Amino acid sequence: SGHPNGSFWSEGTQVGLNGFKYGEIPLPNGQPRKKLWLENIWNIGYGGFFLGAFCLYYGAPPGHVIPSQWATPKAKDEYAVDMKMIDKYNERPDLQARLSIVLKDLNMIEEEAYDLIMMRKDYKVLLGLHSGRVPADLKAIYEELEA
Amino acid sequence: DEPKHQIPGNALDNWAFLRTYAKPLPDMIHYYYYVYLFGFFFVYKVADFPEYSPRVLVMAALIGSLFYVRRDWVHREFKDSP
Amino acid sequence: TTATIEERRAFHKEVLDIVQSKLANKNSEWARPEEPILHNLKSEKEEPHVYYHNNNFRVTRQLIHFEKTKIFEDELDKCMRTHGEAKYRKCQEIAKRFQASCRVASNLERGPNARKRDVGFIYQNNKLRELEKDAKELGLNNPFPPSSPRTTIGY
Amino acid sequence: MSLYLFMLFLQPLSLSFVSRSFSKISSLMMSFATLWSAVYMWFTSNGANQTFYQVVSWGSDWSTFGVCYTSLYISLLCAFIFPICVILVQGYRALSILICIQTAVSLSIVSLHMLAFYALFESSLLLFFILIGRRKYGSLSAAYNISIYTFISALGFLISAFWLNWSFGSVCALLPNEEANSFVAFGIFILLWVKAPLVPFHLWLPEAHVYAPTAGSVLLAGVLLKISIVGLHVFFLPICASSIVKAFPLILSICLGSFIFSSFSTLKQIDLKKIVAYSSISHMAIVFLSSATNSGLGIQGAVLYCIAHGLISPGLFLLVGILYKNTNTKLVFYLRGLSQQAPVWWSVWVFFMLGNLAFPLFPNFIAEVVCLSALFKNHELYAYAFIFFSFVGTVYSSTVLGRLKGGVSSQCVDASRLDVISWNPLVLATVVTGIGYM
Amino acid sequence: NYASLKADTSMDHVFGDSTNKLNYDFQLMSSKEAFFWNYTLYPIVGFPIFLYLYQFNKLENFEAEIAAAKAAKAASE
Amino acid sequence: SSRIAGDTTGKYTPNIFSPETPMDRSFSHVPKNPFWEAWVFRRDNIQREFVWTWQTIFDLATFVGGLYVAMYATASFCSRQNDKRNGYPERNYYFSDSKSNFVIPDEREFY
Amino acid sequence: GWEYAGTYGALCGMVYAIGSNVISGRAWFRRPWVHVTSVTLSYLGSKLLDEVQDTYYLEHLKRVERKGLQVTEEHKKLFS
Amino acid sequence: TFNYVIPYGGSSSYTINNEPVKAEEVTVDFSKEPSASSLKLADKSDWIAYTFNNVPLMATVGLLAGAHEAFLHYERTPIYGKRTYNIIKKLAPIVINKTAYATLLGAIFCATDALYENYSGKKSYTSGMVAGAATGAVFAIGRPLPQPLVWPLVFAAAPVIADLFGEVYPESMKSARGYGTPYGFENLDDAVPTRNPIRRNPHHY
Amino acid sequence: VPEPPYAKYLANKSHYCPPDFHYSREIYAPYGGYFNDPKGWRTNTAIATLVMLAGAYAVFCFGNAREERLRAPKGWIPSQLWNDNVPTPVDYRGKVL
Ligand SMILES: CCCCCCCCCCCCCCCCCC(=O)OC[C@H](COP(=O)([O-])OCC(O)COP(=O)([O-])OC[C@@H](COC(=O)CCCCCCCCCCCCCCCCC)OC(=O)CCCCCCCCCCCCCCCCC)OC(=O)CCCCCCCCCCCCCCCCC
Numbered sequence A: 001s002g003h004p005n006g007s008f009w010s011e012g013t014q015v016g017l018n019g020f021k022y023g024e025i026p027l028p029n030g031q032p033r034k035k036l037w038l039e040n041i042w043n044i045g046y047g048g049f050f051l052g053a054f055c056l057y058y059g060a061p062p063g064h065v066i067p068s069q070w071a072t073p074k075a076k077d078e079y080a081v082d083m084k085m086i087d088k089y090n091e092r093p094d095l096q097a098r099l100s101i102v103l104k105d106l107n108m109i110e111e112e113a114y115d116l117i118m119m120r121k122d123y124k125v126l127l128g129l130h131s132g133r134v135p136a137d138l139k140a141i142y143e144e145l146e147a
Numbered sequence B: 001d002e003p004k005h006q007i008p009g010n011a012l013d014n015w016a017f018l019r020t021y022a023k024p025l026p027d028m029i030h031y032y033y034y035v036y037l038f039g040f041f042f043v044y045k046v047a048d049f050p051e052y053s054p055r056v057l058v059m060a061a062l063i064g065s066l067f068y069v070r071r072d073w074v075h076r077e078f079k080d081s082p
Numbered sequence C: 001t002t003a004t005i006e007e008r009r010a011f012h013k014e015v016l017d018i019v020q021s022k023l024a025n026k027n028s029e030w031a032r033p034e035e036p037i038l039h040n041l042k043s044e045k046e047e048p049h050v051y052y053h054n055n056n057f058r059v060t061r062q063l064i065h066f067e068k069t070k071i072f073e074d075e076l077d078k079c080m081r082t083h084g085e086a087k088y089r090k091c092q093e094i095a096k097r098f099q100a101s102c103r104v105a106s107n108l109e110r111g112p113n114a115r116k117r118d119v120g121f122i123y124q125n126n127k128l129r130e131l132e133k134d135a136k137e138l139g140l141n142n143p144f145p146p147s148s149p150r151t152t153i154g155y
Numbered sequence D: 001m002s003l004y005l006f007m008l009f010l011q012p013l014s015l016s017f018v019s020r021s022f023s024k025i026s027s028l029m030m031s032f033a034t035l036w037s038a039v040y041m042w043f044t045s046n047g048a049n050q051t052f053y054q055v056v057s058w059g060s061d062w063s064t065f066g067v068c069y070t071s072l073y074i075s076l077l078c079a080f081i082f083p084i085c086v087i088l089v090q091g092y093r094a095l096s097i098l099i100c101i102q103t104a105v106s107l108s109i110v111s112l113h114m115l116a117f118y119a120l121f122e123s124s125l126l127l128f129f130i131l132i133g134r135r136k137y138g139s140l141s142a143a144y145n146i147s148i149y150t151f152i153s154a155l156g157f158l159i160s161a162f163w164l165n166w167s168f169g170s171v172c173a174l175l176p177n178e179e180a181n182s183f184v185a186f187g188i189f190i191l192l193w194v195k196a197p198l199v200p201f202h203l204w205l206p207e208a209h210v211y212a213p214t215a216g217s218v219l220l221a222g223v224l225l226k227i228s229i230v231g232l233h234v235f236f237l238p239i240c241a242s243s244i245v246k247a248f249p250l251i252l253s254i255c256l257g258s259f260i261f262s263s264f265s266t267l268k269q270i271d272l273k274k275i276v277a278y279s280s281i282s283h284m285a286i287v288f289l290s291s292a293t294n295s296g297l298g299i300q301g302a303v304l305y306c307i308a309h310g311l312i313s314p315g316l317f318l319l320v321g322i323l324y325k326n327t328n329t330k331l332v333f334y335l336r337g338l339s340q341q342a343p344v345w346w347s348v349w350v351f352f353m354l355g356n357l358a359f360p361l362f363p364n365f366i367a368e369v370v371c372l373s374a375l376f377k378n379h380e381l382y383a384y385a386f387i388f389f390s391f392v393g394t395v396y397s398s399t400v401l402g403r404l405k406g407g408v409s410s411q412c413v414d415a416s417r418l419d420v421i422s423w424n425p426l427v428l429a430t431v432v433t434g435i436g437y438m
Numbered sequence E: 001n002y003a004s005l006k007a008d009t010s011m012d013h014v015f016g017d018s019t020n021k022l023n024y025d026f027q028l029m030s031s032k033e034a035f036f037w038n039y040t041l042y043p044i045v046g047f048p049i050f051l052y053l054y055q056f057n058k059l060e061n062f063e064a065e066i067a068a069a070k071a072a073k074a075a076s077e
Numbered sequence F: 001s002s003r004i005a006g007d008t009t010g011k012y013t014p015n016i017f018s019p020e021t022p023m024d025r026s027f028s029h030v031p032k033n034p035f036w037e038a039w040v041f042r043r044d045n046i047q048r049e050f051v052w053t054w055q056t057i058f059d060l061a062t063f064v065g066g067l068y069v070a071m072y073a074t075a076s077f078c079s080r081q082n083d084k085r086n087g088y089p090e091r092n093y094y095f096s097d098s099k100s101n102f103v104i105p106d107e108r109e110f111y
Numbered sequence G: 001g002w003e004y005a006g007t008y009g010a011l012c013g014m015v016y017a018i019g020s021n022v023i024s025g026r027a028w029f030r031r032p033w034v035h036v037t038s039v040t041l042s043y044l045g046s047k048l049l050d051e052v053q054d055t056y057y058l059e060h061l062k063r064v065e066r067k068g069l070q071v072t073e074e075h076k077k078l079f080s
Numbered sequence H: 001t002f003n004y005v006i007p008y009g010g011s012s013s014y015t016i017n018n019e020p021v022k023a024e025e026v027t028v029d030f031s032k033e034p035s036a037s038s039l040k041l042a043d044k045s046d047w048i049a050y051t052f053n054n055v056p057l058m059a060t061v062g063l064l065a066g067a068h069e070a071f072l073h074y075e076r077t078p079i080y081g082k083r084t085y086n087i088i089k090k091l092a093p094i095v096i097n098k099t100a101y102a103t104l105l106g107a108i109f110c111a112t113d114a115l116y117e118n119y120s121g122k123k124s125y126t127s128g129m130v131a132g133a134a135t136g137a138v139f140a141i142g143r144p145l146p147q148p149l150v151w152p153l154v155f156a157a158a159p160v161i162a163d164l165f166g167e168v169y170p171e172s173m174k175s176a177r178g179y180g181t182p183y184g185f186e187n188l189d190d191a192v193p194t195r196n197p198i199r200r201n202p203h204h205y
Numbered sequence I: 001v002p003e004p005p006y007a008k009y010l011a012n013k014s015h016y017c018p019p020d021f022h023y024s025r026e027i028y029a030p031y032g033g034y035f036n037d038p039k040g041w042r043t044n045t046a047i048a049t050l051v052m053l054a055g056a057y058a059v060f061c062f063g064n065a066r067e068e069r070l071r072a073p074k075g076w077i078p079s080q081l082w083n084d085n086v087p088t089p090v091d092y093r094g095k096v097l
């Protein structure tokens, strides 16, 4: 037992092929194996697919392939506005009372105050105010907080 | 040799049962004549029938389908006896 | 609220005019509208142009909401990581805002069968407050816990 | 879009003019050209056009074709998976049948007219009867099953399409129409009920898959089952949402029952192909339920899971075909010692089976997470039911792997160079989707 | 063609004979036993369902009692 | 008694007349068993031994129908809870007899 | 009516020539004269069919107008 | 919607209603209303009367089936050979028994349907299901094991099929027109008819 | 039985292989054979170690760019030697270092 020459750092005792890969027998004189008919077509077509997918995913401008990428700057701007507005809301208790009235008519709980602030420009609020479902007080409240 | 489905019954008994279909065969014209005649009269009468509920019609169709006997069935079982 | 056929055809003609005005100048952001087409239709499907434009506006808005929620989550995570053990007191507000954003994004277009997403247990807490008020005023005994000051890091 | 449709029409056309000896080479080159055209269609699809990326009409409502999120993913999946089917099939007759089936299926996905959709999908009805019922390796029973089930479901869908064309005056998806009728909803639904196997209308699928050639099985599981999700998203949810919401308790009952009964039935299977077929039936239930919730999370999750299945099931069917070629057996009891005898086949088999069990580094995990989230959005119990019963898939897969993994075997049955070439694209695609490039 | 049905008796002395066979009849559980165990195990599996049903019932009953009392207080007064 | 059929160089020919058996793909096929083949046949063709007996009807109804009933009842309960949670009026489901026409919530309306 | 009737007809004539060759066991390229004749005849027949369809569309528009359908100018434009 | 972000379909307001607008200026109906005979037969008020009005149909079907079987037996019997037995004595039971069984089953179905509808007081699917089930139970009195389950089901299903596609279907899809403008969508600019199309004259056969 | 001609190409039994143990030498596995010990292993291992160190360098670069420390360490941390984004240490009392 032990190592072959007693030293761990000695040349391996096996010379040859550990196994036959794909079951192919090495040519005696070292002649290369003839390539299969499909190898070139397969490699070109699939490599072209994967490379095209890579280039489209990364090369394309924002919002062409991934729609969320386009929305990121706009979300930052709305985040800034919302943050300023919420800060103003916390300070002024008169506005809070008016919104508590607006919320009740809209079948919303008091905690959903921040939610109303965050939906200033959304299908439900925009079309409800026009149609009459949403009380017109909300428009003034939003303007008081710089829209 | 391969696995095969088991056939219920003995060979000679099954063949004997099959041989009960080998009987004098009437011509189909005799049946057709009566069916054509009565069918024509039936179509004439049907115009005067009262309007029946869809449920009753469907039930009548079911009963007729259940009570219909295939021509082969009578042929195999027919016996010229009392 | 009733809509007469005369008014319906009038709105249809106005919608056609809006389409014609949009068609006059090319816009690469035609399907990312910043404003909806306001209407009082019983069904949006009646006016196809309004339906498609408003749907595109709703998609734009929802994408914006999703990105806003991701931004809110990033500030909450930074705030939580900076404060240390004082996170519970100092990060109540940021968390409140993040949870509000999550509710707005999920609830706006939940779907016909989806339930409201109660981020922060606000609805449950409200229900428990109402149940407590009723039990106390009517002299009943409540089998439910009383409402909580804080149920989550924020809401 | 126009390039993709033209390449699609050229692929069946090319066969008529080939030398009859160059058929396989020409077919492979055409398949790769169709894949490249699909990539071009993806490149020319701007996300800015939120509703439909591209719509083309060639003179009539029937010839209206267009690509949406569901359509784009399914079309890319079909173009990706077709080359594998092509190389696996030999003979002009087989090539002709396969190329006609593929052209019909790929044209159906992009069609935006219900009547045109029906015309294109059901054109490949006799071709499947002939393919599944081939002389030596086919079963007439399976052919009759699949054909009759398809005809009855598609005829119901056709009747609903005729009523919608009579009542509204058009049956094109691009025209907004809503219907509250339950007969019409049922007519459209029955097609989806049969095509995407749902208990008790799933019997046609396993028979067809077992007696179909490997190219046929790969195409069937990979994309034929997905054609249901295109019909749901494009031809059912826009018009018959009210009926899906009205029948949601029944839809949920039938989908969960399908998932449970199919899982239990998979436990009694001794044939590898039947195991893979019943796994597909179980997997289809989550996709169907998630789409029926009519939520953003559900539609996206269903499409994503469909892609994951369309990448994992062809792999298992390909490996099973390779093993059957090497051994002429599909009985798990005869196949033993595959770990020692086929270390390379075994590695890929284990990887694909892990993918089928929705492990984290596989696309199935992400897809399942999204679908479960959509169910949890509907109700917590809905999600819990599906999550709990997932163990049954583990029991059957573990038992199969254990039986195959060890024992005594005297035959070296490992994959050749051709077999590794055929699965390499599927492996790479699985890995890429697993890491999050969905 | 087919594999040989003749066994190998080389290792019979070392590892024992194959004469002893299994006593199992290879049949499954009785129908009566199965009904009991399915209708016992499945409810255990669906523990969340019963928790939700319990809480929902309690909530609805409380709400109905509250409404009843409210009505009573709103009638006289 | 055996020879290598495959040739990497591409000069592959099938020696159909060779006395020695080619080591082709058929070399590695597993030997079948008369009894295993009959078991496989019996398992697939199990519809022949199907018999309608009270035990069979009982087992089918109790597990298949029983699961379907439990699943429907659970789904109906979950729908009722969601309707109560959302604040929507009782929805007109297919088998539910409700004197209300509510089905799809209005997106514009605030519930 | 259809703006692609001529192209369709030419391609269909090709379909006839190739199909007839294939059914009889000959190759697609055989009998070249058949190809030109088929293409021309099918193109002309497709065009003629399109005029016939248009003519009966206009006859129908006349009939419906006589019956009392209040077709607008745009509707009268739909039927060339 | 054809997008992955918002739910597909749409929502219609329940508050907002659209005033009905006539399909055409003048409506000419070529569909005749139900006859007084149809209403009389359909009246289930008195179960005995209902049963006696509707049995003629079952009796006719039984007579046709019995005539069929009797003819099949008669055709085979040979004219050339003299027969000891009387043919009518052999054939008359066939026809009589078939007619009697058919009439009895139809009587059971009609009676149970009328009695359930009266006791319940409402026209419902259940009445047909219970009438079918009772008829199928009577059909399978002495039959082997599967038949007691199968016949009550098939028979109960038949009135369900009749109700769904004979009564509910037409009333459900009465509004759809096919000409002019789609029923729901009248805002759209489609040619408006002065009169409805009359594709056929009211039938008289 | 006369070993087949290809058997010359295949490798012998390694030193670690038990003499009684018989394995088929034709089977290929990516993880290696039954007992391995190939010739040229020392070079392969040196190449492996070099690829490991290069990948460690790339991983270190990536981590350093993405390692965000938002709260000051209580005392000096080793990361300061290599990363410049460490907040100045503050002790338990609060004094800056
Ligand atoms: C004195 C002269 C003798 C004649 C007497 C009267 C003379 C005629 C006078 C007036 C005739 C006009 C009206 C009579 C019926 C019209 C048929 C006809 O005339 O065709 C010529 C016909 C011969 O024509 P043929 O082309 O030479 O023979 C073709 C067959 O292949 C023949 O070959 P075969 O017999 O060997 O094969 C029979 C085959 C032929 O197939 C048919 O019979 C097809 C008919 C099916 C329905 C027909 C349409 C129903 C619509 C009726 C409309 C009214 C209701 C309205 C609404 C209903 C909605 C459906 O069917 C079968 O296999 C046997 C099964 C019976 C029906 C199968 C359906 C079973 C469904 C039940 C489900 C329960 C099973 C569940 C459990 C299963 C377990 C898995 O002559 C007759 O048969 C007349 C005999 C009269 C007996 C009819 C019994 C009741 C009549 C009304 C009931 C309606 C149902 C029809 C049932 C059977 C009718 C054949």
Ligand SMILES: CCCCCCCCCCCCCCCCCC(=O)OC[C@H](COP(=O)([O-])OCC(O)COP(=O)([O-])OC[C@@H](COC(=O)CCCCCCCCCCCCCCCCC)OC(=O)CCCCCCCCCCCCCCCCC)OC(=O)CCCCCCCCCCCCCCCCC
Residues within 6 Å of the ligand: G008, G009, G010, G012, G013, G016, G031, G032, G033, G034, G035, G036, G037, G038, G040, G041, G042, G043, G044, G045, G046, G049
């Ligand atoms: C699509 C939507 C659907 C909606 C509506 C659809 C529409 C519905 C209806 C549409 C129907 C479409 C499907 C039905 C297709 C009709 C069936 C069919 O294809 O033919 C059947 C029939 C089947 O022939 P088969 O299979 O051999 O069996 C018949 C047996 O031979 C039996 O033998 P046989 O005893 O019966 O012999 C009688 C007959 C049958 O005999 C034969 O067929 C033997 C072969 C005829 C001689 C070869 C034709 C010579 C030129 C043809 C050009 C081929 C170009 C290809 C190679 C280029 C060479 C440079 O002989 C004839 O050919 C009678 C016609 C007289 C013309 C003969 C040639 C005259 C000298 C050339 C004229 C002008 C030269 C200009 C340029 C020349 C070179 C380019 O074909 C013909 O009969 C050929 C008819 C005419 C021959 C070609 C003449 C074309 C004019 C030269 C090209 C110049 C451009 C053309 C435009 C201007 C015209 C002047």
Ligand SMILES: CCCCCCCCCCCCCCCCCC(=O)OC[C@H](COP(=O)([O-])OCC(O)COP(=O)([O-])OC[C@@H](COC(=O)CCCCCCCCCCCCCCCCC)OC(=O)CCCCCCCCCCCCCCCCC)OC(=O)CCCCCCCCCCCCCCCCC
Residues within 6 Å of the ligand: D012, D013, D015, D016, D092, D093, D096, D097, D100, D101, D103, D104, D119, D120, D123, D124, D125, D126, D127, D130, G008, G010, G011, G012, G014, G015, G016, G018, G019, G020, G022, G023, G024, G025
């Ligand atoms: C202008 C510049 C020039 C540029 C070129 C542009 C020209 C454009 C088009 C021109 C191309 C030539 C057209 C080919 C005509 C002959 C094709 C043929 O015979 O097929 C087999 C034939 C193979 O011949 P073969 O191997 O030598 O032996 C056949 C022996 O004759 C008999 O062998 P067997 O007795 O052993 O039969 C065994 C049979 C096994 O038995 C079966 O399976 C029978 C099944 C019945 C039909 C299959 C039902 C499903 C077919 C779906 C359609 C496939 C497309 C799917 C797309 C959806 C479209 C809605 O298996 C097969 O035959 C092949 C299986 C799949 C082929 C079925 C597709 C052919 C449909 C109809 C062929 C057209 C014949 C018209 C006849 C004209 C005058 C006689 O051709 C092929 O290479 C495969 C089919 C190519 C299909 C393209 C044809 C268009 C049909 C699509 C319909 C769309 C409307 C047409 C508009 C087309 C563009 C305007």
Ligand SMILES: CCCCCCCCCCCCCCCCCCCC(=O)O[C@H](COC(=O)CCCCCCCCCCCCCC)COP(=O)(O)OCCN
Residues within 6 Å of the ligand: D141, D144, D145, D148, D149, D152, D190, D201, H161
């Ligand atoms: C107002 C009407 C009232 C109701 C009246 C109903 C009366 C009958 C209605 C039944 C209509 C269904 C049509 C399918 C019949 C079953 C298939 C025939 C059975 C059969 O033996 O077919 C063999 C193979 O079929 C197969 O292998 C197919 C297996 C079974 C097919 C499953 C059916 C599809 C799904 C069923 C419903 C799905 C949704 C329903 C909306 C081929 O026989 P052969 O070629 O050797 O001929 C030799 C003669 N024996």
Ligand SMILES: CCCCCCCCCCCCCCCCCCCC(=O)O[C@H](COC(=O)CCCCCCCCCCCCCC)COP(=O)(O)OCCN
Residues within 6 Å of the ligand: D156, D159, D160, D163, D182, D183, D184, D185, D186, D187, D188, D189, D243, D244, D247, D250, D251, D254, F093, F094, F095, F096, F097, H164, H168
């Ligand atoms: C027993 C469980 C039900 C099995 C179905 C499970 C899941 C299927 C759900 C599919 C989703 C959309 C389909 C819409 C309705 C189909 C079935 C809904 C349940 C149902 O039958 O409701 C009936 C109404 O539906 C109808 O009136 C139509 C029923 C379907 C017709 C059957 C065949 C139609 C084929 C027509 C082909 C195309 C025709 C196009 C013109 C009666 O319920 P109810 O409201 O009266 O309540 C009174 C109870 N007390």
Ligand SMILES: CCCCCCCCCCCCCCCCCCCC(=O)O[C@H](COC(=O)CCCCCCCCCCCCCC)COP(=O)(O)OCCN
Residues within 6 Å of the ligand: D381, D385, E042, E043, E045, E046, E049, E053, F061, F062, F065, F066, F067, F069, F070, F071, F073, F074, F076, F077
């Ligand atoms: C011939 C064919 C059929 C013959 C044999 C059928 C025998 C099966 C009969 C019992 C089957 C299970 C029991 C479920 C139905 C019980 C009675 C139905 C009436 C009902 O809805 O009551 C609800 C049952 O609780 C529930 O909501 C469901 C509780 C049981 C579900 C969990 C039990 C097993 C869990 C396994 C997973 C299955 C579900 C996975 C999601 C609670 O009353 P309510 O408050 O809702 O008021 C609603 C007004 N009645």
Ligand SMILES: CCCCCCCCCCCCCCCCCCCC(=O)O[C@H](COC(=O)CCCCCCCCCCCCCC)COP(=O)(O)OCCN
Residues within 6 Å of the ligand: F095, H120, H122, H124, H125, H126, H127, H153, H154, H156, H157, H160, H164
């Ligand atoms: C093709 C439809 C044929 C039915 C197939 C069912 C399976 C056949 C087994 C035979 C059983 C007999 C038929 C029973 C089916 C009816 C469903 C039972 C539900 C039920 O009892 O509720 C009734 C209404 O359902 C109804 O009566 C309307 C429900 C419509 C039936 C289901 C429609 C879709 C089924 C199709 C599934 C797959 C198609 C393949 C066959 C009561 O209502 P009520 O008003 O009386 O209230 C009571 C006030 N007294």
